[PDB]
Structure 1
Amino acid sequence: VTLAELASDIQSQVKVIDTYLTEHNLPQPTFAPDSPRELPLDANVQRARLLLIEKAMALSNLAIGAADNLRWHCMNNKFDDMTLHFLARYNIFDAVPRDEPISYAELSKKVGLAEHRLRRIMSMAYTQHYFCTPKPGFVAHTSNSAMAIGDPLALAWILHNIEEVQPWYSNKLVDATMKWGDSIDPKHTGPNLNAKPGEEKLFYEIMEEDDQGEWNGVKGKGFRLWRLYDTDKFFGTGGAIKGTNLLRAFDWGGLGKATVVDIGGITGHLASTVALANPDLTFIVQERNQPWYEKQFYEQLPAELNGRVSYMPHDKYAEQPVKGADVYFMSTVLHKEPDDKAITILRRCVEAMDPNKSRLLTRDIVMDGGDPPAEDAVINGRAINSKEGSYEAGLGPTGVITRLNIGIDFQVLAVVNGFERTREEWVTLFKKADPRFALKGCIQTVGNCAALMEWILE
């Protein structure tokens, strides 16, 4: 591919998006804080968007050239993370007013970062379109920075990656690989590289047991796990894997009066999303208890739910105490479970299921991709705006959704030696748990990286 070929492809993708926004009288995305944070969910818009990102990243890569890419990368990449580290730890998103500029001098006093160093930090952020300088000596928000205003969940995601995953796990993953090999054992991780055998600590042990800190209303024991739960909510409120996309990948309203068992449902934010939109559903959120869990669980659930979402302490490997429920639901649980642990969980579910009335629903990454929601299946436009070679838009070796999938694949690899699966690996795994399992649906909305898979016992 050449520079001109990529630039020509990019124009094709923009025409699709630009036309849709104009024909529907929808605001254009910009870098202003008032910009829309997402493009429309229309499948053709999203397919064009995903290819546009892929082509645009390739264009910048090709124009930088082979000589400068590795050179520039090792110099700059790590400092985009450190810039977000400064912005989070110094609470700079909240200190910069959303709709009006602020001078470096005033911002320096508000956050307690010396002005000279503050200017250097902000200048790096500008290059990735986080904040801008509208006039000399002044800082203003952009769309990318304004989304984090007043949102501790965004700050949780910054700090969890830069202060935990990266220094403790991903930076030591090479050493972990040469010491233990290609492992699926959560003990074979960074923090245990120099641990005496028997004294290893697991990632989730550190999360729930460390008490030397505080986070967003939780003081002492488990503050890291509470921050981890905040980052789980962060991916539910917006973006690729937003919770409301669940409503588009399964006919929740078709269940009528029904009970859903949310195995491993964190704090129930996902259950809360589906239940608010479906007044006839009951959700039992099953999760391991924590000293702060029950008080926080009930402070944050919307009161209009009238107790339809409730918390039941439960060990996911133990016998399922709710028998014959309409749906047993696991969201991004099994991608942290090797085959033998996942088969244990799936067999616990099968025991409680009525094969003629119960469904098993999982949201997980399907590495080779799920299917679009039926109405989006037929490609009504040009292939250049919906297909990269033989792969669906967003997939393939340089696909943007492929990239996000691998990023999550690496995330569970780093912390617990988990892994993502293909569709055939999922079907094989469920059939090992019980040969009666059959995949009736594998729905992945365009722009989403996770698929909602509905399993039944035939």
Structure 2
Amino acid sequence: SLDTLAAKLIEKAKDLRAGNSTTPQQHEALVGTLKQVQDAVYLPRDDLAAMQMGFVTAAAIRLLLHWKVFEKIPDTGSIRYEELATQVGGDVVIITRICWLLVATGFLVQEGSDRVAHTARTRPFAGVNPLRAWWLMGYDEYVPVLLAMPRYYDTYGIKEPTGRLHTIKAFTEGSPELTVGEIMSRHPERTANMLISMSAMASQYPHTGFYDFSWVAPKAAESATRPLIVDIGGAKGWTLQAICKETPEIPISRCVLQDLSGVIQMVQTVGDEDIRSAQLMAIDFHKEQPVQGALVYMIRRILRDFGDDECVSILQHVVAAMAPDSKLLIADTVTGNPPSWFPAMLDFFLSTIGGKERTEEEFRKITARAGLRITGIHYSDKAEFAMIVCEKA
């Protein structure tokens, strides 16, 4: 309510004066309560005006990023608009107007009518880091594709976009005959920025803590030979390291990390010693699963990027390699009907590359097509992200 929002501000204010730390939980609660109140108080005209303001604050930030203006505002203190203008080599009038939008929305602050300064909300824009890279990737790589969606669906029909080709992204780029990866390989600066972005999203879903892997331990004791955990598209092997740290009775030396040649090579070169002890293998999971009869095959945050038919192709290569008692673990969001806001947002972005966040029913359908049955779903505490346990039907 308005009053509980006021209570949370009074609390924050006292804890700052007392120099104590706002927890992530208290911050979330404060922001959540603000949102509840705005949703109760704002009329439709307020909702839509706030949305349009969002467009222009993002454009203003983008334009100042383009002009390298955030780099020139000092970390603390302030800089005269005229000095900014001289250092950019542009007109002080337009630079000041752009800054004023950000002052009116609390991104920047003025110190006297002549000078501008950062807030905590703009310091990430003053240099290279993952939030800024992620911000630029979303704005430059996705916003034009979102604008292109009505034209896309006019062209292809009102149909779920499910292919690796003719994605909304590739359509927007002008090369629908290419995959998104092929398009990005033609764009080295955009890829570089994306690589930094890519690291941030991976870090924010849990690798362990919500599923018991220790049942692999007795098999490792019975069999000296059977491969234990195969991580398909495991990247730099962070998941395998986390599992074997959590349960040291699972020898990482009997696990298998599969990815692209370039990623495996970087693991072999600068990967830590535990992961380098695992069996590393370059594969194409669209065409093959080379490890036969492993106890566990894991597919983490991969199926969300593909349509059903492509997921069933990946899955069936694994099922052909599975022994009768193998498990196939899919780590991915099992979205609700209806979904919560963060997976619902991710799903909307995934539609531009042919993927989606599936419901439990949708996962049942694709695993059954691959000859699997889901025997358990173990949810983490983060936005319906779950371990889906599958065995041969």
Q: For structure 1, which segment, 331-340 or 52-61, has the greater mean C-alpha deviation from structure 2 after superposition?
A: 52-61
Residues 347 and 434 in structure 1, CA contact (< 8 A), matched pair in contact too? yes
Give the counterpart of 1:103 among 73, 76, 79.
79
Matched, 1:405 2:371: no
Give how far 1:335 is off: 1.7
2:383 maps to what in 1? 449
The AA in structure 2 aligned to 1:455 is: V
**Which one has more relative contact order, counting CA pairs under 8 Å at least 6 apart?**
1
Quote the Cα distance in structure 2 between the aligned partners of 1:406 and 1:228.
Answer: 22
Give how far 1:207 is off: 1.1
1:378 maps to what in 2? none
Matched, 1:364 2:332: yes
Quote the Cα distance in structure 1 between the aligned partners of 2:272 and 2:245.
Answer: 10
Task: Specify whether residues 147 and 434 from structure 1 end up closer, same or farther in structure 2 by C-alpha distance, changes over 3 A only.
Answer: farther
RMSD: 4.1
Matched, 1:203 2:186: no
The AA in structure 2 aligned to 1:440 is: G
Q: Deviations over 1:16-49 (max 9, x none)?
A: xx69x98xx99443xxxxxx6xx14xxxx79xx4
- Structure number with the higher helix fraction is 2
Between the aligned residues of both structures, percent identity stands at 18
2:37 maps to what in 1? 59
Residues 272 and 309 in structure 1, CA contact (< 8 A), matched pair in contact too? no
Unaligned runs of 5+ in 1: 1-5, 30-35, 216-223, 370-395
2:223 maps to what in 1? none
Task: Specify whether residues 62 and 355 from structure 1 end up closer, same or farther in structure 2 by C-alpha distance, changes over 3 A only.
Answer: same
For 1:22-101, what aligned pairs fall within 5 Å after superposition?
27-29=20-22, 39-40=24-25, 49=28, 53-74=31-52, 76-86=53-63, 88-90=65-67, 100-101=76-77
Give how far 1:230 is off: 2.6
Task: Specify whether residues 61 and 296 from structure 1 end up closer, same or farther in structure 2 by C-alpha distance, changes over 3 A only.
Answer: same
2:209 maps to what in 1? 248
Task: Specify whether residues 263 and 113 from structure 1 end up closer, same or farther in structure 2 by C-alpha distance, changes over 3 A only.
Answer: farther
Q: Deviations over 1:376-401 (max 9, x none)?
A: xxxxxxxxxxxxxxxxxxxx6xxxx7
Aligned residues: 373
Give how far 1:84 is off: 3.6
Task: Specify whether residues 109 and 425 from structure 1 end up closer, same or farther in structure 2 by C-alpha distance, changes over 3 A only.
Answer: same
3-state SS of paired residue (2:208): helix
For 1:17-416, what aligned pairs fall within 5 Å after superposition?
27-29=20-22, 39-40=24-25, 49=28, 53-74=31-52, 76-86=53-63, 88-90=65-67, 100-104=76-80, 116-125=93-102, 130=107, 132-133=109-110, 137-142=115-120, 144-146=121-123, 151-167=128-144, 169-181=145-157, 182-183=159-160, 184-185=162-163, 186-189=165-168, 191-192=170-171, 200-208=177-185, 210-211=186-187, 214-215=188-189, 224-237=190-203, 242-243=204-205, 245-252=206-213, 255-256=216-217, 259-268=228-237, 280-281=251-252, 284-289=256-261, 293=263, 301-305=270-274, 307-308=276-277, 311-356=280-325, 358-368=326-336, 402-414=340-352, 416=353
Give how far 1:346 is off: 1.4
Residues 97 and 141 in structure 1, CA contact (< 8 A), matched pair in contact too? no
Task: Specify whether residues 124 and 453 from structure 1 end up closer, same or farther in structure 2 by C-alpha distance, changes over 3 A only.
Answer: farther
Residues 175 and 193 in structure 1, CA contact (< 8 A), matched pair in contact too? no
Quote the Cα distance in structure 1 between the aligned partners of 2:278 and 2:61.
Answer: 35
The AA in structure 1 aligned to 2:362 is: E
Task: Specify whether residues 263 and 174 from structure 1 end up closer, same or farther in structure 2 by C-alpha distance, changes over 3 A only.
Answer: same
Q: Deviations over 1:413-451 (max 9, x none)?
A: 12x23222111221232122124x223233131xx2251
Task: Specify whether residues 332 and 109 from structure 1 end up closer, same or farther in structure 2 by C-alpha distance, changes over 3 A only.
Answer: farther
Task: Specify whether residues 252 and 190 from structure 1 end up closer, same or farther in structure 2 by C-alpha distance, changes over 3 A only.
Answer: closer
Unaligned runs of 5+ in 2: 221-226
Give how far 1:403 is off: 2.0
3-state SS of paired residue (2:340): helix
Give how far 1:340 is off: 1.7
Give how far 1:173 is off: 0.8
The AA in structure 2 aligned to 1:312 is: M
Task: Specify whether residues 454 and 281 from structure 1 end up closer, same or farther in structure 2 by C-alpha distance, changes over 3 A only.
Answer: farther
Q: Deviations over 1:336-370 (max 9, x none)?
A: 222221111112222223343x432223222218x
Quote the Cα distance in structure 2 between the aligned partners of 1:112 and 1:278.
Answer: 59
